[PDB]
């Protein structure tokens, strides 16, 4: 016949995270093709501050709620 060459079934043995699957490495998945992981969901924690009313620069009765980063 014709010389045998690997098919998709054979090659996908070498596409996993490891060559010898186990229970520990069942949830391992191959890394991204370009080493770049998705950025994590925005968790920026701005600091909220009451600037007034009892504040020298608040003119007495201003409650300025400010989101501060630093």
């Amino acid at each position: 016949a014709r010389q045998w060459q690997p098919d998709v079934e054979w090659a996908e043995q070498y596409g996993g995270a490891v060559m010898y699957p186990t229970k520990e490495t069942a949830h391992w998945k191959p890394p991204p093709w370009n080493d770049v992981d998705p950025p994590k969901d925005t968790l920026v924690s701005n600091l909220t501050l009451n600037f007034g009313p009892q504040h020298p620069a608040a003119h007495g009765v201003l409650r300025l709620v400010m989101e501060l980063s630093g």
Partner: protein, 98 residues
């Protein structure tokens, strides 16, 4: 080997054991590296000052200069770890598998 060398060498061992047992914070481990440099500085300064090794008296200073470079370098990495996960926890540094 006076009784002072015992405590200084014990300080190094405590900071070494402290560095090898992480809790959560990368910053807590960075302090142990700066603690180890402090022990080495004191131990080297004591030996040099006691033996009247005059020219070696600059070695402890050169030891602090390169301790700052490492400390600054460790802080710079801590900024980038924090910017990626919002904390300095070491358990997040596990994308790479052995």
């Amino acid at each position: 080997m006076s009784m002072v060398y015992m405590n200084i060498m014990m300080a190094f061992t405590v900071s070494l054991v402290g560095l090898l047992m992480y809790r959560s914070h990368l910053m807590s481990s960075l302090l142990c590296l700066e603690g180890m440099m402090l022990s080495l500085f004191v131990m080297a300064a004591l030996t040099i000052l006691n033996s009247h090794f005059t020219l070696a008296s600059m070695m402890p200073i050169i030891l602090l200069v390169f301790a700052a470079c490492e400390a600054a370098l460790g802080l710079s990495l801590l900024v980038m770890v924090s910017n990626t996960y919002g904390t300095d926890y070491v358990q997040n540094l596990n994308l790479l598998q052995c």
